Amino acid sequence: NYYDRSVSPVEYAYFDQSQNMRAINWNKIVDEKDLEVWNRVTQNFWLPENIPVSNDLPSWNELDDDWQQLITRTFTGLTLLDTVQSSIGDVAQIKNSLTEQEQVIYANFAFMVGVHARSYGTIFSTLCTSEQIEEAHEWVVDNEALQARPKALIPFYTADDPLKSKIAAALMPGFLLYGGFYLPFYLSARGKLPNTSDIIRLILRDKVIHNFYSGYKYQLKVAKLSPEKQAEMKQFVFDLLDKMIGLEKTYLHQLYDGFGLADEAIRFSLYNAGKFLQNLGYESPFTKEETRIAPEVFAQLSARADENHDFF
Amino acid sequence: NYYDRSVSPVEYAYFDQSQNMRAINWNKIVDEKDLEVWNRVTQNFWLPENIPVSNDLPSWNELDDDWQQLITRTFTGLTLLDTVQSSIGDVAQIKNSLTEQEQVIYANFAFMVGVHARSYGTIFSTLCTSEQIEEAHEWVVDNEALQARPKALIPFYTADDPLKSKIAAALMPGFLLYGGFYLPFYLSARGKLPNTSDIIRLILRDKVIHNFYSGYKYQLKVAKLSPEKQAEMKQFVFDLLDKMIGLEKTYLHQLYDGFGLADEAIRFSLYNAGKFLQNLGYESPFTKEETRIAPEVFAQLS
Ligand SMILES: [Ca+2]
Ligand SMILES: [Ca+2]
Numbered sequence: 001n002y003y004d005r006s007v008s009p010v011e012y013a014y015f016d017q018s019q020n021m022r023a024i025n026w027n028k029i030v031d032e033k034d035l036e037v038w039n040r041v042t043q044n045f046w047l048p049e050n051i052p053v054s055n056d057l058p059s060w061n062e063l064d065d066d067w068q069q070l071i072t073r074t075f076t077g078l079t080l081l082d083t084v085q086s087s088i089g090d091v092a093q094i095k096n097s098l099t100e101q102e103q104v105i106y107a108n109f110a111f112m113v114g115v116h117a118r119s120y121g122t123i124f125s126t127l128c129t130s131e132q133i134e135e136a137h138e139w140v141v142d143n144e145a146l147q148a149r150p151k152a153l154i155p156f157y158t159a160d161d162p163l164k165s166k167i168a169a170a171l172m173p174g175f176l177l178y179g180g181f182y183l184p185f186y187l188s189a190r191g192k193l194p195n196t197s198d199i200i201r202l203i204l205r206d207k208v209i210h211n212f213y214s215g216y217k218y219q220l221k222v223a224k225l226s227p228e229k230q231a232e233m234k235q236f237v238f239d240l241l242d243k244m245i246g247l248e249k250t251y252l253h254q255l256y257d258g259f260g261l262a263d264e265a266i267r268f269s270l271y272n273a274g275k276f277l278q279n280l281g282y283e284s285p286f287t288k289e290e291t292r293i294a295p296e297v298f299a300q301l302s303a304r305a306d307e308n309h310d311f312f
Numbered sequence: 313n314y315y316d317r318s319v320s321p322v323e324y325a326y327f328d329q330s331q332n333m334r335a336i337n338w339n340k341i342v343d344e345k346d347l348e349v350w351n352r353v354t355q356n357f358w359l360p361e362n363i364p365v366s367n368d369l370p371s372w373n374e375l376d377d378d379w380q381q382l383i384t385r386t387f388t389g390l391t392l393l394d395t396v397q398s399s400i401g402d403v404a405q406i407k408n409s410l411t412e413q414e415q416v417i418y419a420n421f422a423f424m425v426g427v428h429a430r431s432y433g434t435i436f437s438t439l440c441t442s443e444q445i446e447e448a449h450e451w452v453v454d455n456e457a458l459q460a461r462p463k464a465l466i467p468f469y470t471a472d473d474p475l476k477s478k479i480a481a482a483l484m485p486g487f488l489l490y491g492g493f494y495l496p497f498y499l500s501a502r503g504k505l506p507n508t509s510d511i512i513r514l515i516l517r518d519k520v521i522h523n524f525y526s527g528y529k530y531q532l533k534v535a536k537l538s539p540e541k542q543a544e545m546k547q548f549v550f551d552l553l554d555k556m557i558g559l560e561k562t563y564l565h566q567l568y569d570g571f572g573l574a575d576e577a578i579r580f581s582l583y584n585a586g587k588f589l590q591n592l593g594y595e596s597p598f599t600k601e602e603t604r605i606a607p608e609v610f611a612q613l614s
């Protein structure tokens with residue numbers, strides 16, 4: 001009974017002070033899925049300094065300056081998105097949690113997306129020059145097409161609609177970074193930068209769970225709403241995704257057209273847009289033509305993360 | 313410089329949207345201290361499952377059910393404070409960061425204080441009955457003296473003053489939990505629950521850095537203020553600490569009721585109150601007599 005006549009501290013801080021606060025109870029758990037997720041993400045802890053990025057130097061050096069600039073720029077753009085999710089997106093989910101363990105899981109997510117951003121830094125430190133690193137930061141700041149994407153999602157985190165925030169949260173690991181992740185998988189399919197792709201697979205091992213978990217929590221909340229409100233939220237999800245696809249296409253054409261990779265990158269992106277919708281409980285409208293990924297690239301995408309790079 | 317004509321995402325989200333956003337730059341950093349702290353806390357990653365708490369069963373069984381109730385209550389009280397810090401306190405610090413790396417470090421802090429709270433659950437699962445666990449949760453909810461402490465500090469996290477929020481964020485790891493931490497060290501000094509004390513030491517290894525780091529960042533910000541505004545902040549700190557010491561004493565006298573540990577626990581608490589003030593750049597007013605800790609208890613800090 002104590003649980004039903006008390007609130008978690010975050011509920012007390014922001015929503016309701018009619019009752020006293022309860023400490024987190026890990027001994028009687030409301031949702032077994034939370035313990036499962038907690039155990040999986042904590043057991044998957046890793047740091048980028050355990051992966052030997054120096055072994056990419058031979059294949060890195062065979063790439064010309066334009067290819068090296070593209071990689072640096074693409075990765076710095078991905079770093080921006082992780083900075084958004086670490087410092088705003090994931091932490092904004094904590095107060096809207098259904099369960100106590102979920103509050104701690106989103107804290108873990110925010111930290112681990114921080115590590116993802118840190119790992120690009122370790123790649124740049126090993127492979128890139130000081131001038132390449134600085135140019136890419138300049139390029140990210142001045143790229144309106146790049147900037148438009150996080151600019152569209154951030155307002156949902158700072159506003160007071162929890163479901164819209166949760167959708168925006170899941171749209172980051174579930175969709176937005178895949179246009180960029182195409183490049184390292186394109187490269188490693190041609191034997192280029194293999195140790196970098198190991199870092200990308202570790203990042204993806206986390207982001208796949210982040211997307212699933214937010215989608216899972218989204219479905220639980222919207223299931224309680226009226227059919228009218230469910231229909232309103234479905235409309236919002238497709239409207240937002242349609243907008244984000246439009247912005248993503250413009251960014252990826254700008255990023256990849258000179259290398260001839262934009263159409264493949266967009267199909268790679270739309271494949272994951274379908275998976276994003278599936279993880280929110282909706283059907284994907286995209287055709288097999290629209291979501292076609294080349295076998296060699298999909299092999300790099302779906303390859304298992306190496307457990308030798310784990311912390312323990 | 314791209315940096316001087318852009319903002320971090322969190323600055324964009326909450327403060328200023330006039331300029332475009334910059335990705336975190338780990339290849340050129342503003343404050344070398346952030347790298348040192350980041351490296352230390354990440355390398356110190358631990359989970360409670362890797363301590364063999366089951367080896368405390370013999371000494372747990374040597375303790376009567378009044379002592380077992382005290383331990384469960386004390387730790388569930390500490391769990392509440394960690395829950396406040398993980399879910400509100402540390403994450404509130406992110407948007408008030410001086411540097412990009414600090415934003416990510418506070419994300420680590422919130423996660424790790426989460427792990428601290430989780431480790432008490434591991435101890436309870438290993439040693440306590442379900443009814444012992446539930447009684448302690450009831451007791452925490454209904455204890456007005458316990459509740460007064462987080463209730464006094466939470467407003468600073470939800471309010472618009474970054475320095476007052478920072479002071480509150482330092483006061484929990486730097487002061488409030490030490491009254492509870494006295495118990496396991498008192499016990500392990502007498503050979504009771506040695507493996508539990510290893511979890512407590514892993515928690516403290518984090519919390520000491522958390523208190524240092526928040527104190528360090530507070531000092532950098534307050535140094536930029538005018539002497540009058542610096543004096544005003546110093547006055548706020550000593551006044552707040554005075555109130556929190558008052559509430560802690562009342563709580564600890566209640567908590568240790570029947571055991572005779574409250575005076576020693578309060579001295580142990582005030583020792584850390586002095587260290588809290590030192591981490592904020594102020595001097596400790598507390599006497600040697602007021603902060604006296606027995607050698608055997610102090611030995612368990614290490
Ligand atoms: Ca093409
Ligand atoms: Ca048991």
Ligand SMILES: [Ca+2]
Pocket residue numbers: 572573574575576
């Ligand atoms: Ca005494």
